Symmetry: C2
Subunit: 196 residues, 2 copies
């Protein structure tokens, strides 16, 4: 009565809905909004930013990040050099621009030269094997997109309370899910599904 | 009747208030919240994130960034490798943690080894000469702190509308300033003050 079954969640995700994603069933977990990178619109990015930390990240497979020439920022969260999609962006930071960059990172036709670096999106490198190898929200995002038959790219950000800026724990995530009609899953639940 | 005189604004800034900062008087300019890095509290960071893009940046002089071993992210906005202050942070992304990191970047006693890289704050390198050399919001932040007698470090983020996630132009910034009791200045106005 809290968590949506994985197959129903995948259909929602396939249809461009967010999911609220927790690590497991624990009440003290903090929730992230995750949706498919290729499906995020200006409006959906506006929504993500409105209700989150705004430090918007785009999980990609290591293979995809390599293809796009997005190396690790340095040589734990695997940040690459940041980027903006060049054509059709101005400030890079607008909801429109961040959404366009995110969709572009997912698009199999995108080329390394299509992006300006640094920029205003934070791509993250998901490890090969995804949630079977590392139970990160990065791997969760790419796993969700893969299971949904979509490009191996997601977009994520942490839910934050309007009242005081504290991250939303489970109870607040339940309330947020009900208010906005967004389904909730957890990573343990997702690992159980993909395993056996 | 729109813009606060610079000397009054500096006193507000010295006292840990935000200023809303525009490029010049143009109605189409978009506004950023800027305050002194050393003075940003958990609550003030929560406020900044709540009403902004959340892509929170910390302007520092090139000299200071060099001292802290924060090189340009690559080798236009001069991003360094991102960072979190190690001691007293957990997730790095919480209002508490981002505020602590920001204050730490300003603290003259901070050392390079005190920071984890990458992290969740985006330091920016202000050019020597500040607004006399480049009229960026980065230089504006460091200029404001310098004029206020504070460490040459600021913290900034773009105001965004709750309704639709669009960045706030002048009229909305005026309304935001009135609602929250925050003074508004512009960069041309600031350059006029420091020049002559």
């Amino acid at each position: 009565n809290i968590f949506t079954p994985i197959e129903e969640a995948l259909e929602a995700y396939k249809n461009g809905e967010f999911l609220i994603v927790m690590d497991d069933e624990d009440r003290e977990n903090e929730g992230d909004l995750i949706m498919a990178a290729e499906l995020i619109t200006q409006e959906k990015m506006a929504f993500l930013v409105r209700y989150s930390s705004g430090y918007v990240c785009v999980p990609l497979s290591e293979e995809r990040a390599n293809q796009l020439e997005l190396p690790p920022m340095l040589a734990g969260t695997a940040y690459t050099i940041t980027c903006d999609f060049a054509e059709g962006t101005t400030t890079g930071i607008s909801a429109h621009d961040r959404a366009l960059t995110t969709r572009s990172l997912a698009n199999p036709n995108s080329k390394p030269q299509d992006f300006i670096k640094p920029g205003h999106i934070l791509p993250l490198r998901a490890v090969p094997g995804l949630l079977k190898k590392r139970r990160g929200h990065t791997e969760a995002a790419v796993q969700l997109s893969t299971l949904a038959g979509l490009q191996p790219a997601g977009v994520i950000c942490e839910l934050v309370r309007d009242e005081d800026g504290l991250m939303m724990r489970l109870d607040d995530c339940i309330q947020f899910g009900k208010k906005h009609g967004i389904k909730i899953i957890n990573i343990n639940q997702l690992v159980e599904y993909i395993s056996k």
